[PDB]
Amino acid sequence: APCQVVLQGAELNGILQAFAPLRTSLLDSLLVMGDRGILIHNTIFGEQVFLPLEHSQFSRYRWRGPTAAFLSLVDQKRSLLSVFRANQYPDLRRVELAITGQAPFRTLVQRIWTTTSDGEAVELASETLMKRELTSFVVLVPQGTPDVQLRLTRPQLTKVLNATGADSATPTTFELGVNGKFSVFTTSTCVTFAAREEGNAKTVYGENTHRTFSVVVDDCSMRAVLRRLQVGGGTLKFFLTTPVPSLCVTATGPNAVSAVFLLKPQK
Amino acid sequence: TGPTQRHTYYSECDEFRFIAPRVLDEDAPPEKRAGVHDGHLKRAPKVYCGGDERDVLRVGSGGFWPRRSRLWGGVDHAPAGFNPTVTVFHVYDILENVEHAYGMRAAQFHARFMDAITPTGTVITLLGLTPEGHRVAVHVYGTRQYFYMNKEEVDRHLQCRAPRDLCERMAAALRESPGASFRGISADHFEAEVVERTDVYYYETRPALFYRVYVRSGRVLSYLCDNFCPAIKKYEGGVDATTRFILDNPGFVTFGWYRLKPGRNNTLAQPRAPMAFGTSSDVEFNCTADNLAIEGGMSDLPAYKLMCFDIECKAGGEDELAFPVAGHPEDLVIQISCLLYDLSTTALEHVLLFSLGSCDLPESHLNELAARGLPTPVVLEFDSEFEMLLAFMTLVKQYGPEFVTGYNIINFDWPFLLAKLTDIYKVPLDGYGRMNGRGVFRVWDIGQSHFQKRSKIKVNGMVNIDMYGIITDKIKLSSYKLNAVAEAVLKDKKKDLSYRDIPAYYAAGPAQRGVIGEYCIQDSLLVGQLFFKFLPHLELSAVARLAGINITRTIYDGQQIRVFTCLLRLADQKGFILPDTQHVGYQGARVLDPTSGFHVNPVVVFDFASLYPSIIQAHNLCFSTLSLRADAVAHLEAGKDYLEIEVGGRRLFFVKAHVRESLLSILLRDWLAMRKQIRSRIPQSSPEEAVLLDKQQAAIKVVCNSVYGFTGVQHGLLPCLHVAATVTTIGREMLLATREYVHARWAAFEQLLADFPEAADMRAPGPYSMRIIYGDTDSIFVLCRGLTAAGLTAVGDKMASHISRALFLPPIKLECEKTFTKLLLIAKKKYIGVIYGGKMLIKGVDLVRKNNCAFINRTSRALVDLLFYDDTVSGAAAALAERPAEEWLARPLPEGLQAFGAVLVDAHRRITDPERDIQDFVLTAELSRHPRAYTNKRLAHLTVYYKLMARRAQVPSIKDRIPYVIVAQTREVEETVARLAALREKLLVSELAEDPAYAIAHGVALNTDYYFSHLLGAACVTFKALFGNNAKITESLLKRFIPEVWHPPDDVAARLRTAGFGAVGAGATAEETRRMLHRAFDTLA
DNA sequence: ATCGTAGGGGAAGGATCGTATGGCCT
DNA sequence: GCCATACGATCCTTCCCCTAC
Ligand SMILES: Nc1nc2c(ncn2COCCOP(=O)(O)OP(=O)(O)OP(=O)(O)O)c(=O)[nH]1
Ligand SMILES: [Ca+2]
Ligand SMILES: [Ca+2]
Ligand SMILES: [Ca+2]
């Protein structure tokens, strides 16, 4: 296998911890792999769900060819990512990814180990999966300057998420503040934060001082998807520099997930 | 003197209805150009030909069409002193009519021919040809229908002895009938006698006394059998007088040569006076049954005439693209083509083209016809449609074609002509056949009534043979259109002309009319070519002669009538009388369990020859030989003298042949001789003729096996389910006995070698595993692994002969039919195999079914040929059987299955390209019932039927196949479906079918997903036996082959690109995409 | 008015069930 | 942990087409 990937228990614990809140969504998703790691792409409610996995997160990750794309499901209703969910198999030992073949005919073979009552061998042989290359594929990934960042904590989601979620008729009016705060007056709730960007629950502990982002969101839906991914909290990254501003909510912790949405391109 | 019988057919006309298009007179300005002329015109009809004007009803001297009629409206158009002698004549049809002495008192008939029909009488008319060529119609008197009644029942219920008193009571009952039509009927019309007869049913029935009643009419017998005391059993009350005349005189036939001979008391047949002629024949005779004899010398057809005809119509009202309607006066028959052949040398004699208006045929068509030696066409021009129709009818009456043919004439041509002649112009066509009047001229259709299953046409002295029906049951094609069959059997690619461009051609000019006439003449020539290639008249005449009925009844009635008529002869000969009585019924044959898979070892096939007839002959199964109760056969030795069987929980006794011979045994013995004779000429000399002898012998086999169907019909005529159930039980027992005998005799190690030393040469490595893997009624498949296929044919024949000798009594014979080399068993009645010679046999699967399109069929055939011919893929398929299918769901496939993926990807590429041929994606569904008789009403072909009816298109009949194509599901299509549902009152239902012509005209895209899914389904269901008969695993494996895994954004790529999103893969095949991944990951991680 | 009975396979419809989570627990 | 539910497959009948006997 020119691109054999081995994931042992030491990193399996981290992968399982990362996937613990991801009990869904990623089951139906695309996986793009290259010389750096694995990126998981999904389109949940028209929202770009991205999960990065760097080479340092695998014990024996390796690649030799160009970028490749694999669809998780094999022969329908059998996801390659079904090993990384809750406690479907309570005896997870090791994960093997076997990429073999030529550049347009690369195939991924997944074999799963098992920590039995008196062993930690392969045992499981009927659960091995095979998936062929996606051939022609185009993937768009959000890239650009993060602009102003911020460290939003877990309790803040009770008011920054459950405020309007009702399209442009009841929008959140994504702003920071005309004086240097992070108070997003949506329509009536008027959540108030103190910003105080370095470099008190009111303070959001922001970074990369911009304090000018005030463009209204394209349409306020959010909610469910962030609720669906069970994200405790994370950093908000802005992409208003591009002609179409975007917002990226990236979780906090090892192998965090990011939800990407498009804002009003009027500016 | 004066014609005794009035001539109903037109002979002198002065007034007629004038209907013709207005674009024919002088091409008037658009104001007075549209529409159709109408009104009443007072002038004699006339016909134009080559600038010559003639009267249609002007028999004598000059003429345009050939004539073969002697009399015309009471005028003898024959040379003086014309008294030809008649000794031998070939009769082809038999008529039947009623005559009275009062009507015939004007003629000079003999006393013996007048006293026999003095109150009323029935005369049998035989129509035929003399060797010279004179049409002859000979009349036979003295035939009266008769039926049997129980003497005890009438004596007990009515209490009337003195059989004359029975006739008096019958006449009194008839006189008091509710209808005022049985007036003047007395006891003299009936003849009651006492006879000793035995009932055919059951073996314990004792001979008794019956009243045999002779009735001297046809409707009187039916009324007596229907209304007169329906509580008394009646025997042979439905047999017509023609059958009585045929069976009373031994050796008489309905189609063959006859000779006139002096009668009993040196009496001779009386030639009839020309003025008293009742038909359109040249010479007529009066005689009785004693004056006719059968001539076994002549065995060739006389110079009969065949008329191949076709008609064309053009809508003359609003929306000219609509199909013509017979009831609409504006719709007209613009042209008729008539080709007259002689049925003795298969040579063209005459060509005629009736056209409404001027018609100049192109010179190219004339040159082409002259190049082949065909006669120059004759074109007759008419001013109105009525003149053309009258001229056609006059030609039919005068020339008198004994045989008439065409294509789709029963459903379209004849009904259209009859409707136009009767409903519009009010013409009596009763006397337009061969009889001068009061004849039969009618067409029956299927319609809503379930009583009939076939459309029929009855014309007296005129055998109509539609070629559509003949083609339908001789070759297997998805579409039975004229162009398709012409390209199939004749291999002649012929041009076609639809009905949507006919009005433009007609309104353009005479040259376009000539082009239309050329196309129509080519159509008629093709129909004649098919008729003379297949020659149905010979086969139908042979069947009619063997059965004992008319050729018309052979063509149109069915299969029960032949068996009943042929059994009536033996019933009368043996002293029996047949009584009159007018969901799954019983259990049939057994199909064994198929061990589905791909077998490389040789497979031999054993089959019984004429299973059911042999069973009936050997076991003596018949109506007369059957007892449902014991103590009625308890005077014969058990087993040796009778056979006891257990059928349906009931014990039945059939006594052996030496005690009481079966009536059906002689029936099958007589019917199998024709098949034996037919099959004896195939291997003698037949390069390509054998394909027709095969169809003939198949038809004879069908009519032979139809005896079992006749005896097994519920609510039929003369039924007895016991015999049919016994035959099925015996067949099942024989099949099981053969299976057990083959398993338990030669299967150990050496018994086959001991029985046949020739097995020493043919011995492949491996042990004997001779076993049966499939069975169907009487066919047994034996997988003889470990033996070479080169020595399994003579050995097979020897084994079959030994089994037949050692297990079954004659005439039951089992023979080794085929010997497969590679077999692929799928399910019951579904398998594809290869014969040892090299031919490939396909049974059951969608390749040999008529409801699949051309693309899927071609792809499946390519896959089957690949699997059965290439060595690598065959070896890989054989190796696939070692592991279960589940292991193949997670293990790479063998390297052999590579060309399969190539075929799959080629098919996918060909199905997903611009400008696809629509004719390769058309499916066909047969309409078998009336649309109102459908419970589901959702079948994807009734939708096409209703769509065609809504737009006033050519509505298909109740027995033809509707073609359709599945269109793509679009917003416009969905809106149209919703509008149609709302007016005529989620994923769309599969009723997306559309007429192919409509899709071609409007350019509608086809649903590629549906066709590709159906292709994959057919491929998996055909080859599911390779993966342990599992559909899901096979489907998943087949879908793994396809590269259709393109994943483009749903039109959201532009918005993301405008937001500063990097591009990965796709056209960017260079290395920067790798950096892009880094460029992405640093943004995320 | 007028041959019979076993079999598979595609299509439209109704009832059944194994899970995916949230509203609610809290 | 919970419990609720709208999705979804998943059979299971019934009717209609052509084929093999
Ligand atoms: N009622 C009826 N039964 C039929 C019909 N067809 C088959 N059978 C039943 O016979 C089973 C053998 O059929 P074949 O085609 O071998 O015929 P065979 O007589 O065994 O002749 P071969 O064995 O020589 O083919 C039929 O059309 N109607
Ligand atoms: Ca026509
Ligand atoms: Ca035609
Ligand atoms: Ca047979």
TrEMBL record, chain B:
It comes from Human herpesvirus 1 (strain 17) (HHV-1). Replicates viral genomic DNA. The replication complex is composed of six viral proteins: the DNA polymerase, processivity factor, primase, primase-associated factor, helicase, and ssDNA-binding protein. Additionally, the polymerase contains an intrinsic ribonuclease H (RNase H) activity that specifically degrades RNA/DNA heteroduplexes or duplex DNA substrates in the 5' to 3' direction. Therefore, it can catalyze the excision of the RNA primers that initiate the synthesis of Okazaki fragments at a replication fork during viral DNA replication. Keywords: DNA replication, DNA-binding, DNA-directed DNA polymerase, Endonuclease, Host nucleus, Hydrolase, Multifunctional enzyme, Nuclease, Nucleotidyltransferase, Transferase, Viral DNA replication. It is an enzyme of class 2 (transferase). Residues 233-485 form the DNA-directed DNA polymerase family B exonuclease domain. The gene is UL30. Its EC number is 2.7.7.7. This is DNA polymerase. PROSITE patterns: DNA_POLYMERASE_B. It catalyses: Endonucleolytic cleavage to 5'-phosphomonoester; DNA(n) + a 2'-deoxyribonucleoside 5'-triphosphate = DNA(n+1) + diphosphate. Belongs to the DNA polymerase type-B family. GO terms for cellular component: host cell nucleus. InterPro entries: DNA-dir_DNA_pol_B (IPR006172), DNA-dir_DNA_pol_B_CS (IPR017964), DNA-dir_DNA_pol_B_exonuc (IPR006133), DNA-dir_DNA_pol_B_multi_dom (IPR006134), DNA/RNA_pol_sf (IPR043502), DNA_pol_B_thumb (IPR042087), DNA_pol_palm_dom_sf (IPR023211), DNA_pol_type-B (IPR050240). Residues 1050-1085 form the DNA polymerase catalytic subunit Pol C-terminal domain. Forms a complex with the ssDNA-binding protein UL29, the DNA polymerase processivity factor, and the alkaline exonuclease. Interacts with the putative helicase-primase complex subunit UL8; this interaction may coordinate leading and lagging strand DNA synthesis at the replication fork. Pfam families: DNA_pol_B, DNA_pol_B_exo1, DNAPolymera_Pol. Residues 549-1025 form the DNA-directed DNA polymerase family B multifunctional domain.
